[PDB]
């Protein structure tokens, strides 16, 4: 499979590495999302691993209903292409910007579905390591999907740990900042931060940005705040909310919710905050979502930010002075077609 | 916030 087999429809998204497009497979008239990564950008250890693991997790995982599946992979001389399922309900950042705070029942719904996705990855020996509002999409019906798997640790034996300093500063866990080896615990910390954002309407470390001192609007100042400052819960939120946020945002991973090596996920299910959640029905997509995203027109482009969708539908012409400098050897055996 | 919401790796 190649670029020939796809009718490019619209630009829908942009990461640091990637440009995202809506595409149609000419063979079947199914529409997919196409992540286009320029090889120009992938140069170090940290960059090749990002693509290789993203591919590996799409294969070995991603069968789950709250994870994005992969149609296929291919390359031109300049770019890597991932063809993945089109999910058209926006992301939780986009949704949070429209409705500044969420009700607790909405936050319960979204965090339950994430928890199942995380637990599924955890039991396949995978740490997500980049949970954030941007990486949690809503589908057309209003259920979540986790998307960006490039940061994942994999091949983790049960009770192993790893050492890499990665993630997103807002969501980074104290273990990582302390320089400790870490396991799945970092994912549960991130969920805590994520749940805080949904219920409170702002990050717990939101002061980092507003200060008169330039040196206190710094990644290093954020990391100091994550480690040493106490996270105050807003008075609005119930006793159950306050408990789960404080339990997930415990600075010690040993004593954090979700992180007992035996009973971790069970402890989450048994928390008063998730009293009335039917976890089997949740996982079978049988709990009616609290919000149905608006889908309009031929493709449902409503919930993608207009800056992306206005941009013209091309792939940028190549510059042969840059393309000739690329090591093609590093992307051999990239091609993949999903065994239908 | 500041765009300390950007991913990274080291």
Numbering used by the authors:
A (entry chain A): 249 to 588
B (entry chain C): 647 to 656
Please give me the paper's original passages concerning this structure:
To support these findings, we investigated how the P-site binds to aPKC in its unphosphorylated state. A peptide spanning the Llgl1 P-site is able to bind the aPKCιKD with an apparent affinity (Kd) of 48 nM. We screened for crystals of the Llgl1 and Llgl2 P-site peptides and determined a medium-resolution structure for the Llgl2 P-site peptide spanning residues 634–662 bound to aPKCιKD in the absence of nucleotide. The Llgl2 P-site is identical to the Llgl1 sequence in this region but is ten residues shorter in numbering. The cocrystal structure of aPKCιKD–Llgl2P-site revealed ordered contacts between residues 650 and 656 of the Lgl P-site, including the C-terminal S653 (equivalent to Llgl1 S663). In this poise, Llgl2S653 is bound ready for phospho-transfer, with Llgl2F654 in the hydrophobic +1 pocket. The R655 side chain forms a hydrogen bond with the G398 carbonyl and a phosphate oxygen from phospho-T412, while the R651 side chain at the −2 position, relative to the phospho-acceptor, lies in a pocket formed between Y419 and E445 of aPKCι. The structure confirms that the Lgl P-site binds aPKC, thereby presenting Llgl2S653 (equivalent to Llgl1S663) for initial phosphorylation, consistent with the cryo-EM structure. Absent from the X-ray structure is the L640-S641-R642 motif, suggesting that this motif may not be crucial for the initial C-terminal Llgl1 and Llgl2 phosphorylation. Thus, we can predict the phosphorylation trajectory from snapshots of unphosphorylated peptide (X-ray structure) to a stalled initial site phosphorylation (cryo-EM structure), as well as the S655 and S659 phosphorylation binding poses, on the basis of related substrate peptide structures.
The mutually antagonistic relationship of atypical protein kinase C (aPKC) and partitioning-defective protein 6 (Par6) with the substrate lethal giant larvae (Lgl) is essential for regulating polarity across many cell types. Although aPKC–Par6 phosphorylates Lgl at three serine sites to exclude it from the apical domain, aPKC–Par6 and Lgl paradoxically form a stable kinase–substrate complex, with conflicting roles proposed for Par6. Lgl has a double β-propeller structure and contains multiple phosphorylation sites for aPKC–Par6, with at least three serine phospho-acceptor sites (S655, S659 and S663 in human Llgl1, within a segment defined hereafter as the P-site) that map within a key membrane-binding loop13. The structure reveals the intricate interplay between aPKC–Par6 and its substrate Lgl, which, together with in vitro and in vivo data, supports a capture-and-release mechanism involving a stable phospho-intermediate.
